[model samples]
Target: AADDVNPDDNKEDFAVLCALAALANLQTTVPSIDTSGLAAYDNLQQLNLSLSSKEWKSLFNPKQPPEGFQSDPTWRKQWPIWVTAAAALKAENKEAAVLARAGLTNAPEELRNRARLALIPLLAQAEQIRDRLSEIQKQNEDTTPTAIAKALNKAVYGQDKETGAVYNSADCFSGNVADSTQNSCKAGASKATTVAATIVCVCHKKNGGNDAANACGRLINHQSDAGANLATASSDFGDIIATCAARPPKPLTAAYLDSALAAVSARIRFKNGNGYLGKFKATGCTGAAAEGLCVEYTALTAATMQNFYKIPWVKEISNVAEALKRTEKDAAESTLLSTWLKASENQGNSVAQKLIKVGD
Candidate 1:
């Protein structure tokens, strides 16, 4: 039958059935990726042959979301899924970058799934990177450079090192302008030593560890006036912080995302095994209704059963997907697949709403 040229007249029907079967197959394939229907190469082969090549290709490789795909909130929600899938695929094959590109550009079905598989890790890494950057930026905001500089000034110019208390101006400077030239040495020595110590302390705390010594050295070298060393130190420290804040971070790339995902995947596995019917459970529906709900839930989990006559898989999938979408902004496990389903639900819901108001 692999070479059978005669197309089955029922091929269209068979294709629909197979595609529907694939949905249920996906339910089993997801969560731990149990590899349910993926092994059905014959089913894929048969399904492939059933439809025209163009039709089959289009079905499997749907058009990608447009450029700036992440700009739309709905599309943005699915970015993680694609990136995660990309991460996985790249791990299995050294040349998976080609597949990833094809998947994004409506390539073959197998290629696209490979692309999706690769992206999972990438998506996870991207999120981690985003979170890290956000935390660092928050820290920078909390410890503003100007504030730190001002504190350093006070510690150097206005306080006694030994007592850690405020000092009188008389202790800091002589009132004799007549001896200003003669006392210049005393002025620079006291001021420079105090500021140098304060800069060491400030830079140590800012830079952390031995880097503080290096930072302090750099700040000290920037001082032009020993009498004005306190002010100069503060300005230098502020400049140091500003430079750090402005420095661009390494750009996020697929290779980097893959590496991050590899580290992360060691501890956790991505799974989407929650059954569709189970998602419909609501509290307090008693008597026959509760009994019916339980029966449907059991039927859904049973592998050999077909309950489509009683409940349509497409409709239920749509419902569950909608529920997840409505809750995605808050859901911790909101994956790319989940958000994609959510987007799909809106199209179905729009059609149903129109049908109900047909008279209007």
Candidate 2:
């Protein structure tokens, strides 16, 4: 981030300072957004590249490595878009700067988010050219942690992650190790959330009364990890996610893990210690895992799902969205349906359009 300070005393200097302040505070802008689970992607090409298994010695032979070959390696790739945007802004090409900021995709969940939050300063550089600076600022301030997390996903992944990682043809194939692991981990984590939601829904009816159930269920399911953990005890949904957290660790396919970690690093709530996510050290050395002090990338998503579980209605919708996402038939059909829906003159019939219409 560039400095907001200027030695001269003038009106333009003050404006520059204000803009810098805004950019420096993007993470603060969206306090409620659950930045914990964010991962970024550039165009589809880089995204696909991120999912490959670097640990595999050869793409041809997919055998588990012999002992002594610790396959674990750094997972995420560099934030090209974020870097480009920063440079573009420095270069004074406002349009390119905007694209660079927009292009700051391809990061794993955490990094992608951090990069976006970090870009507040860069965005300030071009505030005059961009339309929603003030509105973006206002919304950022008002957004919840969960909403912020989703917003980071939208800014970083847009609709691409939903199609590529969430639903893809080769996702289930064992030969594609990285893709297979990520897809599997994501699928498993998603199911864990559903099971938790069902229990809460049922429990709410038993002790809280239907109205209480509705409110209780919503409270149990609508909040983030902190929310879910702190929600009224009657819901009794934590065990479902506990099971997920306890499940055998997802294989660390170097390629996928690297990309995933890197992506997450970009968007994670390090700056804010976002409680909804399994919090990680915001600033520090790289390689050393923070242990109980911070959450690892592997269990991060589950932690985020737990975050939304605390909110009313959010748990159900997140569950349904993710569960349907885990199924092959559902995913394939959804993709084809989305294609047909989007193929229109007005773009109104598209799934994306319908999403905005229904606010899905």
Candidate 3:
């Protein structure tokens, strides 16, 4: 009766139980969360609309270009229009000398130390973007594990980007989303299985108990109809249901979580041969009678689906975050190049005068 009593009154078995028993309900004061995305969400629709607005469509659409661009004597103001200036300085062309003279008298001012300084960081920023884009592309080409995993997940589980079709819906499968009677999506974990089970479910033997192909037939578990089946799964804490076998499903420790996450990150297949790995692992398997096992191998285990909500995106940031980071980069260069080209075409002033147009 005194399970509440100190170790002094407890038997060894009961003693061992007491510490963990009440621990279940004993939560403490700890950290907090910041949730701005919930309140002031980034409006992706509005951002894209702005891309097509009148101001942006024109070649002059410098997102936030240097000031006084249309008319001003300073090289800072004139730099955007004059495309040939940078080339003039580099080539030691005769146009460079003429453009320099035109700057002082006819155009803005062909060569200025201040304008060169502005070009400095603009080029630097482009390099950063170029390098990052290279990495993202190179990884995709090589079928690096993360890239392949993410692509498979999106194709299998994500809504269609163009149609917003959930694919599990009868309307989606029938290709009648625009005007169909079966537009509603399939509910919960079935949404995952209805489509992909035969595609990737090789190791999965829902029909066979112990004889299941991948261990996935035995782990935590996917989502519900709408989306919140994932709500509770969002949090990072807690153990999940898994089986080492010959016993009741065990609550997997954090260490197990670690390996499962790794399998997701690397290209992999389980011994059950259920989860397909390698670039060419599951050939025509998409049409075959089995699920590929990405979702089940990563989440949707025997009793919990937390891992479904926890897959690590390689970029680790939303599309919105990356867009803002990019805004600073191309805007500056866009104005520069646009100005240079327009100047060349507008008047036959030659490269020298193009230089003058930027500075003059």
Candidate 4:
């Protein structure tokens, strides 16, 4: 059958060979309709976690955002939150306004920004509802897509004001993280999925593939198992891009590594002067113990992952490098670098073990 599928001979006697080749090529990348869920990775036993310290620069550079912001169904989980915020603003009734103001003040800076952006639509809908609050109530209906999107957003972004669940992980790190009492990993996982989905959706758009965001929307809204749904959506986005047929428009390895680093760097920028690490930075991490420990770990692990290890992630970075050169997007490059530097400086220090643990 392999011989039958080869398209090596395309010209004359090559017709059968050419057809066979094309068929094989297509077969290599084809999506299995039955392997739609998490089962896809089952056959893919090996997951490369390799890295290249030298190409670390790619991680901090700018990356192309997915096609349209929130364009893909699976990746558009934030849409409804955007809508609901707008709707709440529109509801501008005494109760709604009070709640909105309260939520706004107490919410994290990121959430505040999202809520603010969400207000644009809120203003439009609010205009309609200004004349008739009763009619506005009727207008604020939730479609399955919209509702699921909103729920996912809340699950990923929203936090309990009192518990600091965003920063802590024990309580909510259980089977149902969204519903967790005080969890961080579950939230982190959701954020990871969101980040990955967003990137995949962007790649899908560039490559003219299926919309990962739309897929996210459907999974979150329709699937009964919310956690499983999120996990599946994560897998789908990742697997689809890795499949033979659909290729990522660009590589993500550098961009994400950079993002991780940048997140860390940004955290350091706002030092509260709490630990030896602060003193080390105040003096300089050039050779200080606290700083050295991180550098030793980050640089060493970065070096190891990039050089010795062979990981899917490392492969992803290689793919990204190839794609970057081909696409030559300066903004994308900037994103890759900016995020990585920040993440390394900020998140890297805070979660020093993360760098070491991932290697294990």
Q: Predictions ranked by TM-score, top down? A: 3, 1, 2, 4
Task: List where candidate 3 sits over 4 angstroms from the true fold.
Answer: 1-70, 73-156, 160-214, 217-275, 278-360
lDDT of each: 0.27, 0.26, 0.27, 0.25
Q: Which 10 consecutive positions of candidate 4 have the poorest summed lDDT? A: 42-51
Write one digit per residue (lDDT tens) for candidate 3, span 41-149.
1111111122232543343334334455544454443243222232233344443443343232233332332333333443344334333433333333432223322
lDDT of 2 by residue, 14-85 (tens): 222122112110232211222111111112112222223344313222132245533533111223333332
Give model 1's clash tally: 20
lDDT ranking from best candidate downward: 1, 3, 2, 4
TM-score of each: 0.18, 0.16, 0.20, 0.15
CA shift at 61, candidate 3, in angstroms? 25
Instruction: Count residue pairs with overlapping backbones in model 3.
Output: 27
Per-residue lDDT value at 237 in model 2: 31
Q: How accurate is candidate 3 locally (lDDT)?
A: 0.27
CA lDDT, candidate 2, residue 166: 22
Model 3 TM-score?
Answer: 0.20
Residue 188, candidate 4: alpha-carbon lDDT: 17
Give the best candidate by TM-score. Answer: 3
Q: Please identify model 1 stretches exceeding 4 Å from their true place.
A: 1-109, 125-129, 141-147, 158-360
